[PDB]
Amino acid sequence: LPSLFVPLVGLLFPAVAMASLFLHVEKRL
Amino acid sequence: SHSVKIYDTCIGCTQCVRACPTDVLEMIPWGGCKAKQIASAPRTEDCVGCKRCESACPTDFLSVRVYLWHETTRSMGLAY
Amino acid sequence: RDLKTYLSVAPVASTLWFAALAGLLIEINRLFPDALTFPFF
Amino acid sequence: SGLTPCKESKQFAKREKQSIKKLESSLKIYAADSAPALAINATIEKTKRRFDNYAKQGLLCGADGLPHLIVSGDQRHWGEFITPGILFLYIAGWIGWVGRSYLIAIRDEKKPTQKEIIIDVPLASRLVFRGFSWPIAAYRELLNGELVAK
Amino acid sequence: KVFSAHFGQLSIIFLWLSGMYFHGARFSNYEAWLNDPTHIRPSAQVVWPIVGQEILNGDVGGGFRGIQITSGFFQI
Amino acid sequence: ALRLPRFSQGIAQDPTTRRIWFGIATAHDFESHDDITEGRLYQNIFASHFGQLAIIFLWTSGNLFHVAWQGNFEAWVQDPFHVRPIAHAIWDPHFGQPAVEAFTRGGALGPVNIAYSGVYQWWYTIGLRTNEDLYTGAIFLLFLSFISLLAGWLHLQPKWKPSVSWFKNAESRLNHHLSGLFGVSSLAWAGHLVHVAIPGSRGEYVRWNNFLDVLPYPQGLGPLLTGQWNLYAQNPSSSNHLFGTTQGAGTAILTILGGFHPQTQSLWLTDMAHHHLAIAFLFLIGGLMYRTNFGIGHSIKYILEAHIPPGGRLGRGHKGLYDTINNSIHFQLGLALASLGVITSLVAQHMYSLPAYAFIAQDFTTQAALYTHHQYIAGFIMTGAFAHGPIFFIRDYNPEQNADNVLARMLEHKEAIISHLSWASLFLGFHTLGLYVHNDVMLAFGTPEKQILIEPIFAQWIQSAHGKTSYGFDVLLSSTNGPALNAGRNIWLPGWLNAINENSNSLFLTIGPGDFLVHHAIALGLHTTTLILVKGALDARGSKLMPDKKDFGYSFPCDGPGRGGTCDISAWDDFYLAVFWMLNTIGWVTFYWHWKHITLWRGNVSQFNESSTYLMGWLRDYLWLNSSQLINGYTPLVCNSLSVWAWMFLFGHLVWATGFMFLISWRGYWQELIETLAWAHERTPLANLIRWRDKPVALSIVQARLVGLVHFSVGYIFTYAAFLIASTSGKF
Amino acid sequence: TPPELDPNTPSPIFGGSTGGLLRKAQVEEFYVITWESPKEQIFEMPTGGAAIMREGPNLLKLARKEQCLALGTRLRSKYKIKYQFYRVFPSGEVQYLHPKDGVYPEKVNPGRQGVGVNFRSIGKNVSPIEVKFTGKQPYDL
Amino acid sequence: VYFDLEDIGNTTGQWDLYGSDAPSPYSPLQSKFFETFAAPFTKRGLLLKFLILGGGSTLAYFSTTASGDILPIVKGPQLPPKLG
Ligand code: CLA
Ligand code: CLA
Ligand code: CLA
Ligand code: CLA
Ligand SMILES: CCCCCCCCCCCCCCCCCC(=O)OC[C@H](CO[C@@H]1O[C@H](CO)[C@H](O)[C@H](O)[C@H]1O)OC(=O)CCCCCCCCCCCCCCCCC
Ligand SMILES: CC1=C(/C=C/C(C)=C/C=C/C(C)=C/C=C/C=C(C)/C=C/C=C(C)/C=C/C2=C(C)CCCC2(C)C)C(C)(C)CCC1
Ligand code: SF4
Ligand code: SF4
Ligand SMILES: [Ca+2]
């Protein structure tokens, strides 16, 4: 049942994305 | 910080300097008017941008202008 | 009292004016009601 | 004019009929010799008069059964739009012209605002009837109608 | 200033009360309502027959045409 | 640079949370970025353009993939009238058992969404028949989306970046966009029609495997080059023709019958192939007007310089206007958006009246959706057109270089323009509302005969000129002795006259006094929104209250409380104001459209004609009436398949009202509130172990209006969409 | 002329307030305002409610400066007082802010030199396009 | 209470208020058990990856299921308006 791509888009991608953005945003070169 | 300029249109009334809550302007000798003085913005780093200065200018058009620029802690009026 | 006349002709002048207008309009309607057209030509 | 004249519209007749029956229904509770009865009978007589005039003045009606107005300019219906309108523009022009006569009388004076919040009624009464011949504003237009500075 | 202003306020309230009692005397069905309070609608304002407003004088009972009031004055 | 956003140093040195907020809303404003040059400006845009095309190609690729994988289509092709197209499948763990039951429709195996975009009718008309066709199409767009990214990356490389003067080569681009992008594209589209689309509507399947040894026409290209093109219109499809089959099928590939195919109620495929072929000519020849490298053509500049009416009533006319536009990308975007906004509305008003897709007219929800869709898109586009216009005046407008030309004279008499727009708005407003209220009082006093119902005879006269039998009038095409009629006699007219006088279709619908009033509302909406926008544009560089409104830019919070107070005095802020009015205008337009149509589909045009003349009628007989099945999506007793629309309906109301907070309450209140919370965090044990890296502050003055407007807009759009779809699809 | 220096001088009588210094004072900056009082007096605190001036030299630490001027301005009128305020920093360096040039800013002083003044006054500034792409800004000129 | 440039920290109330500073109340060995068994998660970065990849796939794994709602189930579908 491919409909299990939903969580990946639904949650995993968002979590990774958020974490990454958060890090990039708080970075101090 | 914010940007604040003065123009030879100034008449030396001195009202803005009296109006400013953070001591940004001051008066300096000049010879372009009967008052013989003109405003100056030597400490624009402490300005907040409330424009109380502008609100107090009687020139036809403001002789003191405040151009809101990059925000700093000082300009954001933060006590924290 | 000059002065009383002066209180008058203020925005009380508006209400006296509009009350007169309202009256006139009302009487006209009472006299000529439901008019959707000018039929005298 | 895809409509039919009201005089010969069934829907227009059904409305007059239905309206009168509604008012007559109310007539029943009050009995005869009575204040409400006379009031309702007066509305009924005012109702009949209304519909009677609309038909009488050749107003078309729509499938809805209600008159509709022709504003195209057609000669049979000037009463519908054009005649009343000219009447308006006369009055509107009157009011505006008198209002502008006052400001010019007031403008070169003392504190001009003083007579804008406290009306000079002697002056106003002097200028009100000048609006009667306001379309001779046209002749001011041939010279001093509007300011040249702008 | 505020003391006389209160007199001015009271004057209005008394004038306002004067009207509600008056309208309950000239333009109301209180005497009708007094016999059959459970069915007759309390009303204390009649409208002039201009421009079509008389429709607002509805069936409030008691052989009376008017506007139903919800002030509560009849029960007072 | 140092940290985000590193296209702007001064904003990265912000110690507050404002740096993040503003870092996102200025990411595309390339001109305001640090160390920007004209070179990097055109290159960034050019690259973004490929990125945009890549997303578009990818987006459509998704729709194709999902319709093929989760939609019937094939089932829909056999029964267009009696099969609901499927958008895609629903997989939601939050779904209760009932919701899964209620939603599994269209003969699917599980819960699905029903498509209302109309891609089914489009692809069926286009020639697509099976899922295999859809997949290869999806592959093709996925491919096109890749080469878009690939080309965007390529021209960002130093040895492939185009110079600025290349971007400013106007005559070359126009010669190619007219001739190639418009012409050849349209020419080749008619090719698809006569090869695949038209034969597909006649039962024969022409794909890549067999489009070479198969003729689109018996005489096969002979007559085209011969000059006797008339042969391609010799034998059109019959009046008893059935779409997709040979029953009644003709041989013609290029006709001009006019009107509709009886079965599908849509424009003839042979009418549209001809249409694009004819189009491609005026475009192909049209794209040879301007000069390039062959010693022939026009200098666009020299034309503008030459167009100065003697007696100088337009001053210096259009001189210098070439560089004014070619140097300013905002002027170009403004022109682009305005033009695009108009034909976006043109699309809306033509696709409901003259359907081009088979069996699309019968689908009422799709027809309602698509119309409302484009009218809001068009509306948003129109405000943007009037936003970059102002931006142009501030950032790119050169007063000396536009001395006394038509553009300068606009600013020169700006007060006159603004005051008359104000008069027109006031005139329309005072009377349209005036007449509506008068009629409401008559209905209130129970005397509908006293209403003011003005017949729209001007527009009725137009419809008659088109050939509508109603109203009479005996106008052109409505009169037997008319030169215009006998000229088009038995070409497009029999098809046209038949269609315009069919009582089912939306081809020039009958209009009455109720149509008169709403149109003036519409007129009111247009004039006011324009009044706001052009007052914004023409005052962008200054006013009496703020002579130097330039120097401060397009968007700034204000100019303080001095000189009376100057809130919402920036050109950005009247945009902000105008969006409200444009939302109000399009709202009136779509209310008008949807009510007129649901009453038509219901066979009850009487209800619209008698209730649209007073405003209580709109509230009661349109909004209150059609909300019945919608708000019963879920119930203390059950849930329906309309439950999602009921939920979204409230969602819209919520977002809408949430925006009222940002618009009514302003910043100083929230700043003082937050600093008391700043105190709390530091003075709370266990919690002050954790410190914020960005200083918490209230949203800025402009940011508030943006956030507020977005909520207001999102709520607006989501609320009406929930109502439009549910009330329609619940009844169909 | 050299500014005054401090500091070991006492501070006024207060009971405690929530408007007081925070982490910003610890890691960014904080301010001090100082004055001479003729009598032991009561005054309204900008941050808090009410405090008692102490006769003689007085020292107050406030966050933000504006608080310093607001109190100081109040000190000048209301009661006649002479005040000064400095910027502390966290390292320990201190910076004299106001008055900063002998005399107050309202009064013209000869020592002062102008900053940010444009001799072509008016709104004779150039259009934004003119400086487009030039880091400059029209007013800066 | 005080104010010395010498000691700004103390001047601006930088006090470790509720800080303990006391010795460890935890019994040893217990600490050592936790110090050797929780050690892999203390490296950072790697913990971030272990939680993403681990949490991601662990989540995926519960893809598999029954009494969630994977059953439109034997229920005669309605038409249910003009039909379809
Ligand atoms: C597309 C995004 C998405 C997805 C796939 C889900 C999925 C789910 N939600 Mg969530 N939710 C979302 C968005 C989403 N939600 C949003 C936007 C909101 C705000 C409105 C919520 C608010 C919400 C609430 C209040 C609840 C859910 C619940 C659920 C679960 C209900 C089904 C069930 O009972 O089975 C099984 C039930 C279980 C408890 C199985 C547990 C699943 C295991 C433990 C997963 C392991 C943890 C995971 C790996 C860690 C994440 C790692 C990752 C971030 C990298 C299901 C897992 C319910 C729930 O989870 O129950 C407590 C519930 O209470 N959702
Ligand atoms: C061809 C189309 C087009 C293009 C290329 C541009 C390009 C530009 N615009 Mg224009 N604009 C357009 C159309 C266009 N616009 C239209 C149609 C309108 C009317 C709505 C506007 C109104 C407008 C204004 C008022 C402004 C611009 C500005 C700009 C410039 C900066 C853009 C930026 O970085 O901000 C980045 C944008 C974002 C990060 C988007 C965030 C906010 C959006 C609206 C929220 C998203 C909607 C919402 C989340 C939907 C989800 C809801 C959910 C529940 C489903 C840039 C040159 C700005 C400018 O002049 O420069 C100073 C400026 O202030 N535009
Ligand atoms: C339903 C609410 C509402 C109404 C009625 C209006 C009405 C108007 N707007 Mg506003 N607008 C609104 C909401 C509304 N707007 C919202 C939410 C926004 C977003 C902030 C805006 C933003 C906006 C802008 C930027 C502009 C307007 C303008 C206008 C005027 C347009 C011209 C016109 O219609 O002439 C007709 C007048 C009306 C329809 C209102 C008159 C009301 C009655 C009928 C007057 C008669 C009074 C009657 C005697 C009763 C008296 C009561 C008694 C107590 C005295 C008009 C006054 C434009 C303008 O100023 O025009 C030049 C303008 O540029 N609007
Ligand atoms: C707590 C309530 C709740 C929650 C958590 C959900 C959650 C979901 N629903 Mg359900 N729904 C609900 C209530 C809820 N619903 C109710 C009451 C009804 C009526 C009965 C429905 C009816 C319904 C239907 C018909 C469908 C769903 C679907 C879905 C899934 C969407 C899958 C997806 O696109 O991925 C991700 C989400 C998105 C792509 C949309 C997010 C939009 C954002 C705001 C765009 C802006 C992002 C911005 C740029 C910031 C980016 C940052 C970020 C990347 C970190 C998701 C699991 C759909 C489904 O099954 O999937 C195929 C489906 O078709 N729902
Ligand atoms: C301020 C106070 C002091 C000022 C007063 C000083 C001036 C004093 C003058 C008073 C003199 C009174 C004159 C009496 C006149 C008679 C009145 C009369 O005849 O009754 C009204 C009469 C009709 O009257 C009818 O007469 C019939 C004849 O026997 C019967 O009597 C009927 O009963 C009666 O109804 O005519 C009208 O003028 C009514 C016509 C209405 C016109 C409306 C058409 C407009 C509607 C459509 C247009 C839409 C416009 C919108 C445009 C924008 C669209 C986008
Ligand atoms: C043949 C035909 C016809 C035709 C008509 C016509 C002729 C048309 C048209 C039309 C038109 C006539 C249109 C228009 C329009 C418009 C618009 C929509 C506008 C706009 C705009 C804008 C937005 C602007 C902006 C700007 C600014 C403001 C500044 C400067 C720059 C710019 C320019 C950008 C008819 C129907 C009769 C009949 C049938 C057929
Ligand atoms: S206030 Fe205005 S006028 Fe008075 S000095 Fe300052 S600038 Fe010159
Ligand atoms: S703006 Fe406020 S702070 Fe900046 S100078 Fe004018 S007065 Fe002083
Ligand atoms: Ca038709």
Automatic annotation (TrEMBL), chain C:
Protein keywords: Chloroplast, Membrane, Photosynthesis, Photosystem I, Plastid, Thylakoid, Transmembrane, Transmembrane helix
Q: Does the keyword Chloroplast apply?
A: yes
What's any GO biological process attached to this entry? photosynthesis
Transmembrane portions of the chain = 5-26
Look up the record and report any one GO term of the cellular component aspect: chloroplast thylakoid membrane
Q: Where in the cell is it found?
A: Plastid, Chloroplast thylakoid membrane
The main location is plastid
Taxonomically, the superkingdom here is Eukaryota
Q: Does the keyword Secreted apply?
A: no
Q: Short name of one Pfam family for this protein? A: PSI_PsaJ
Kindly list the positions annotated as binding chlorophyll a.
Answer: E27, R30
Topology in the membrane? Single-pass membrane protein
Question: What SUPFAM superfamilies has UniProt attached to this entry?
Answer: Subunit IX of photosystem I reaction centre, PsaJ
- Family affiliation: Belongs to the PsaJ family.
Q: What does this protein do?
A: May help in the organization of the PsaE and PsaF subunits.
Protein name per Swiss-Prot or TrEMBL: Photosystem I reaction center subunit IX
Organism whose genome encodes this protein: Pisum sativum
